[PDB]
Design a protein around this ligand. Structure first.
Ligand SMILES: [Zn+2]
Lengths: 25, 81, 129, 150, 157
RNA sequence: AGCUCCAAUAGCGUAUAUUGCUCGUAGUUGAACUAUUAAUAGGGACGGUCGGGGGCAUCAGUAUUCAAUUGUCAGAGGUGAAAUUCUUGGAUUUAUUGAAGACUAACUACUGCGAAAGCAUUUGCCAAGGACGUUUUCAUUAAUCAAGAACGAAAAACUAUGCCGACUAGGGAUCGGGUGGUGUUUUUUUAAUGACCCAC
């Protein structure tokens, strides 16, 4: 319960951090 | 009904109160030694008798049950107990 | 209808006492109720009681002064040992020294103080305070 | 309670304190045994037999005038019952009401009261089967009723 | 019952009778009738959103004369109720607090100097009777006595 | 003076999140007691009753509608006033019968009876039911019910609402039965020993 919630907070956080800006190569 | 002991209740109250709510439940009917002049015969009769009891020797109607206590037929000499 | 005879009798006495009468008709009787009234008498929670006999199941009459605050009966008659007597007394009764709880042991029907005195335990009936 | 109904009207005859014979009574054990067994050969119901005793024969109660109860007397003499008189009477009333239903089909009054009497009979037959004086496969029907009352 | 003229006429239906013995409109009404109508209109229209004290402050009168008035009025109402129920009539069913409302009270205008009901007894019946303090901190009370759960036994034993 | 003040000072803020009716089956509750009782537990019988309780015919009240017979001949109806309609082959109306199809008023309510919807003339026939009363019978056979079943005319509703209870006492009223007294009212060798007063 709490473990699932804390891992959810970390995972949603770092997913938001790994999504980034578009770029043309 | 005003207020009373429950231990040894007064005899007037034991008679006036319902016979199931008194201290020891018990009856109120009794028996009658009745004599019929058809043979000058004596019979033992219940006071709330449930059938038309007839005399042993002669065929005379003694009483018909009318509700609680019976009415003896006319011309029979009765005595309590 | 018939919930249990112990519950019926004790509801009758506590009802009439909290109203404030002085003589109560409890009917019918039982030996567990007789010893219940006996221990309540010996701690002085009532006045004096009497078994009136009618040969089916007798009547019980009580003269009680004023002291019955509240007393009842537990439904699941479980097991207790003596540390559980401590925990149960504290969690059931009003306060620490107050009231009594009544036990059915191998030495029959008596409260927890004489029970701890005689070193027994058993099933539990109810409580008086 | 007034089972399968709603009243509280008490209909109970009380019981005396003393369990002996009264004084002015002058009839003996075997003599009332004679009268009860002659009544059993006549063919009435033991309840009514004790009734006509306490009306006519002065017997205040049969068990206390002879330490064996009325059913003990009948089982002793061999006049034992086949099914108890209460269930016999309920069966008779049930088959009478079924006859009324057959003659006048549209009587929902008789329908519902027939449902209630058969409920009562289911309960009482469950008891008589558990004590098992009754054969433990007694399954009531209208033909069984008409054969036991006819 | 959403209409405006209808219900005002409906609750003024006894006032116009009392001050008449039909001019029921708002121009042919004249005098005492009109005064009482205006009072009752503003009464309801302020009662729907006000504080009930300053809405209906009851006008002052010494204690024995007001109690004599309310005694006489309840006596008349009771004799009226008895004559109706003896020679069977129907009547408007009212709540247990207030009195009746008769042509007597409408004409004689007694509501303002006696009131709807005994306000003290009104608050008395509205408050909740005080029970005992909870000692039984473990189980559930029932007619059968205490019931203590096996959850509780697994908690304690 | 480098505006003023305050808090941590080896730590520190920010943000998110938190602390209908009745039967009845499982389950649940469920008399005293060391050929026992018979619980102001339950069933049963019997005696007298009670009821606009139920099914089946049966007899009847009026009213309405139609038909027919006679009466005098000029409107009848309905509405706020109107109108549709009927009314020289005699409308409506008065008298006579006749017939059909619904309802059984005044008595009618402070109620009775049914589990509920429901329930009002008569006499029969049939079959159920409550309560009373019994020194009558059995022997705990009782109870709360979820699933299943039976019963319920089926435009309807539109100001109504009083805390609740394992509930203590009560009072005047009723309805039904019994117990007793007391006199009336009754009547008496003949037919139903009923009504009223009061205490229980
Ligand atoms: Zn003779």
């Amino acid at each position: 319960p709490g473990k699932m919630a804390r891992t959810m907070q970390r995972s949603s956080d770092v997913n938001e951090r790994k999504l980034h800006v578009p770029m043309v190569d | 009904v005003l207020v009373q002991d429950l231990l040894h209740p007064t005899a007037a109250s034991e008679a006036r109160k319902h016979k199931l709510k008194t201290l020891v439940q018990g009856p109120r009917s009794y028996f009658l030694d009745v004599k019929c002049p058809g043979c000058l015969n004596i019979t033992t009769v219940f006071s709330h008798a449930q059938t038309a009891v007839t005399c042993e020797s002669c065929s005379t109607i003694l009483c018909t049950p009318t509700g609680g206590k019976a009415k003896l037929s006319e011309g029979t000499s009765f005595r309590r107990k | 209808t018939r919930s249990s005879v112990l519950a019926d009798a004790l509801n009758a006495i506590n009802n009439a006492e909290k109203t404030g009468k002085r003589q109560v008709l409890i009917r019918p009787s039982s030996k567990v109720i007789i010893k219940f009234l006996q221990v309540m008498q010996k701690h002085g929670y009532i006045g004096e009681f009497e078994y009136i006999d009618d040969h089916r199941s007798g009547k019980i009459v009580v003269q009680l002064n004023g002291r019955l605050n509240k007393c009842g009966v537990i439904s699941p008659r479980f097991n207790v040992k003596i540390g559980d007597i401590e925990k149960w007394t504290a969690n059931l009764l009003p306060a620490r020294q107050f009231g009594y709880v009544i036990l059915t042991t191998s030495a029959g029907i008596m409260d927890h103080e004489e029970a701890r005195r005689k070193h027994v335990s058993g099933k539990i009936l109810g409580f008086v305070y | 309670g007034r089972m399968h109904s709603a009243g509280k009207g008490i209909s109970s005859s009380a019981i005396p304190y003393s369990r002996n014979a009264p004084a002015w009574f002058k009839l003996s054990s075997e003599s009332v045994i004679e009268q009860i067994v002659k009544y059993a050969r006549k063919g009435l119901t033991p309840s009514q037999i004790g009734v006509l005793l306490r009306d006519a024969h002065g017997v205040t109660q049969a068990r206390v005038i002879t330490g064996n109860k009325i059913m003990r007397i009948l089982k002793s003499n061999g006049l034992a019952p086949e099914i108890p008189e209460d269930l016999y009477y309920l069966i008779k009333k049930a088959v009478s009401v079924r006859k009324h239903l057959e003659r006048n089909r549209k009587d929902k009054d008789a329908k519902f009261r027939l449902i209630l009497i058969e409920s009562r009979i289911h309960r009482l037959a469950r008891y008589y089967r558990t004590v098992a004086v009754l054969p433990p496969n007694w399954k009531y029907e209208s033909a069984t009723a008409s054969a036991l009352v006819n | 019952q959403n209409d405006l003229e209808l219900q005002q006429f409906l609750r003024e239906s006894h006032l116009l009778s009392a001050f008449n013995n039909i001019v029921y409109q708002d121009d042919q009404v004249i005098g005492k009738a009109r005064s009482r109508t205006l009072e009752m209109r503003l009464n309801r229209l302020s009662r729907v959103n006000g504080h009930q004290d300053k809405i209906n402050k009851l006008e002052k009168v010494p204690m024995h004369i007001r109690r004599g008035m309310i005694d006489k009025h309840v006596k008349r109402i009771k004799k009226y109720e008895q004559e109706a129920a003896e020679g069977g009539i129907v009547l408007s069913k009212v709540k247990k607090g207030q009195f009746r409302k008769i042509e007597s009270t409408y004409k004689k205008d007694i509501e303002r100097r006696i009131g709807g009901s005994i306000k003290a007894r009104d608050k008395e019946k509205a408050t909740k009777r005080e029970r005992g303090l909870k000692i039984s901190s473990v189980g559930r009370s029932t007619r059968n006595g205490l019931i203590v759960s096996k959850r509780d036994i697994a908690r304690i034993s």
